[PDB]
Amino acid sequence: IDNSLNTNIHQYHIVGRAIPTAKDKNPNVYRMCIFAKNDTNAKSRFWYFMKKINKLKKSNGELLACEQIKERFPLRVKNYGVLLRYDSRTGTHNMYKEFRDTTKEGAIAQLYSEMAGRHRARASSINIIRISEISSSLVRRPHIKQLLKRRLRFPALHLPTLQKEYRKKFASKRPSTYRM
Amino acid sequence: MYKKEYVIDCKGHLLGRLASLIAKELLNGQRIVAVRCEDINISGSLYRNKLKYQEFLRLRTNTNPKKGPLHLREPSKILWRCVRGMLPHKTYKGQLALKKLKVCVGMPAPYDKKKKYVLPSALRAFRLKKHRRYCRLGTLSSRVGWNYDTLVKKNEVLRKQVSKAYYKKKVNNLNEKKEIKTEALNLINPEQRQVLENFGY
Amino acid sequence: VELTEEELYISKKNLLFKRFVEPGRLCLIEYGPYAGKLCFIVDIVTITRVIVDGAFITGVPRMVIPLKRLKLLKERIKINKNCKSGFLRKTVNSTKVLEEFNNSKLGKKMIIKKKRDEATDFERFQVYFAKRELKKKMTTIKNKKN
Amino acid sequence: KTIVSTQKVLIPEGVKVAINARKVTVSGKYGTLRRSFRHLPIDIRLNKLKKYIKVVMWFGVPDSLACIRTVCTHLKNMFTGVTKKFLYKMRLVHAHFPINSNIVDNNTRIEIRNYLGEKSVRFVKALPGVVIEKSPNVKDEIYVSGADIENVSLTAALIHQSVLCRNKDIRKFLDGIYVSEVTTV
Amino acid sequence: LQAVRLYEKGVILGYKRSQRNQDPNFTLISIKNVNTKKHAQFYVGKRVAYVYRTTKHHDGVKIKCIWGKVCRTHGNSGVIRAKFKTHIPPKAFGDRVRILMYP
RNA sequence: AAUUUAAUUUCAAUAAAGCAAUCCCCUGAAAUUGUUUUCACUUUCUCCCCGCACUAAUGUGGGGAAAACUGGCUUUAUUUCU
């Protein structure tokens, strides 16, 4: 529906297996959940992991399932812990981060934004190894601990912007910053 | 626009945006009187701006400064130069736009009688954070020796005090107009009076 | 123990800060698909973003927006933090906040403007005609006063 | 980063405050002191009845925390100054030549003669509201007093800066007038 | 007073330029009220009249007219492309135009 | 501006019932190959105790209770109140 705050990164549960052979009379079936912008991207990342772990390329296997995975309670805000492997210019690093968000997909988008903004790391150079809902008391980030207080009621303190129609070129008098 | 003369009170406005908005209007078609032009804001610091003006002064010519550039010292002329930069002034179309612009430091009284407009996106408050350094264009000009400042300071104060006397008189007049209007609202025929009230009187 | 005349003192403080991001405060959306609608502050996602939830009158679903897209109103209704749509409807109906908004000067300017926007051609003439009657009478009163 | 940072600033009993829109003014026995803080964008609020001031910042960063701690210290100095003037006791050191300290202009300008036997005059005028007296008790001692710790210190610094040698060794030659003791009346 | 105008005001901008390139088939029109594509879309099919003053008597008169019609936007701020029955002169850039209420 | 019948772990009210209280839709933390079992977690503009105004606050720091309004489940009907 939305296109004003929207994230098109979604989560897909993907299942595949090795093709039956004389050597592989009974295959091994493999499942994983993967965050991607589309089904082809999800599949290609799944295939890359099948290649990295197993000996199975797209040629050597067959896809059992790919399906988008559904938010249980979208109105509820939840504490996500996310564990990364990422590449810098001069090396590879592991990192564990906390985000309070409605859903895991919002968190992954936030994570890519954070890694890009603060570390210059592109989506290609990041690998999420597990994102999951965790207890509020177990968060290490002060900015999320501050939200988790009993009484939250800060003053808003931001600029007006309106929209294109009432985005006047010139004005008779000077604007009111406080807004009250 | 669609009006004979825009007058702009350029106090508290940020240089680049103020110039750009003026320029596109000149190109669109409009005579524009830029007024109160020492109280324009540059986003750099005083030292940083002094350095930039120093580089501008350093730029001259080896050959013959009679064919050199102009190091205009008026804050109004600084705005004018910036607008000129934002016009294709070596054309005829650009020259016509350039001619349409009028610049003045302080409030010239024939155009103080006129209404003043502002450009709301271009204020220092509007596009700069509070905790980041800035510098007033007149302050910078004074630093690099323009020094026509005290006369304007006296003139602006005298004009402002008269404007206060004008504002109180205007308030008196408006209050009296409100009082007669409210009294003579009773005398209107009921249905018509109800309609006028409905649509916001 | 409790306040007596110290009650006046706390009351008569001149503190600038008001319109806190409290749960159940009314806010006017200024941008996006649901612009010009009024809505309550439910949750706070993060420093930029909040969970807003429309009035049943205004027709805006429960959803995340940036706080920057709201113009906060004075009124606020105190509610428990976990509440959903039935309780929000029951509370809004109870507290009659839209009437308070209509009474409020910004609300009043908006509703007057709304009438003026929707006014028909005959209605427009009637406003002109009424103002003309008023000016005639008002000028006659100005003659009267001296 | 943080949403909320606060400070609760105790005020002495006699202080007559007037601090609106971050233009802080404190009056007391020794004077009225005015000091803008309008570059610092924070919610200091007064409480007259139960005394104290509450300072609060919205959406703090460590820069903001530095500002809050700085302002509260600065405000406390303003209270301290009006209640009791800040006195900088400056001892005049010389290992050879008598250095003549003649206070002129009603405790406003100290005349200094004969630094390193120079046979010449250095006059060093004070800032507004900072009195320069001499000590009856200790011959080398000079009292620099006023309502503001910054102006008295600056006045003292000006006196040091005025005296100091161009080019005879800093380790060897120790002569000049220095700030010994920072007190109040 | 004596006249009633019965059009809305506009400003004949340039032709439908792009950086350092010219298309003279389409003209760019600023309509006084508009500042959005969506609002401009209301006025999209309307007949447009450029009236201009001249030196000599032509058909006994010193006023002449070019006709065109608005037809599609040129931006999100509602600046609109108009196609005319013959190209309007660059001399008339920044001049006024009449946007009729019909069809 | 919409629209059709499908498809895909999708609701939300409506007003009468029930059910459990750190309990539950949930989510934690624990003892080849499947289980399964433990205790951890809600609210409050309710009440109490200490600190009595000690707070960012039309309150508050710490310590305890209370309830099921709030949320959650099981129902029974109801969908242009939403």
Next chain:
RNA sequence: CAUUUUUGGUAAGCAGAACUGGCGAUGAGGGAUGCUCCUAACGCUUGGAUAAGGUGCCUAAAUAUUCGCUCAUGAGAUCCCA
């Protein structure tokens, strides 16, 4: 001449090779400008919608939205490219 592989030579907008594509023999749009980079090869016209590429102004489209990071008493800002 370019990418990639490449030999000599301290290196070289240097000399010498390989594969392929260009230019030469080529307009057009971008790369601020530019024989070669990128987009793309061309009768005459009308209209559309896009590419490369853009959208503060010069200069056509956003002082768009959205999250980070960033103040520099010579900051930084589109391959070749200084």
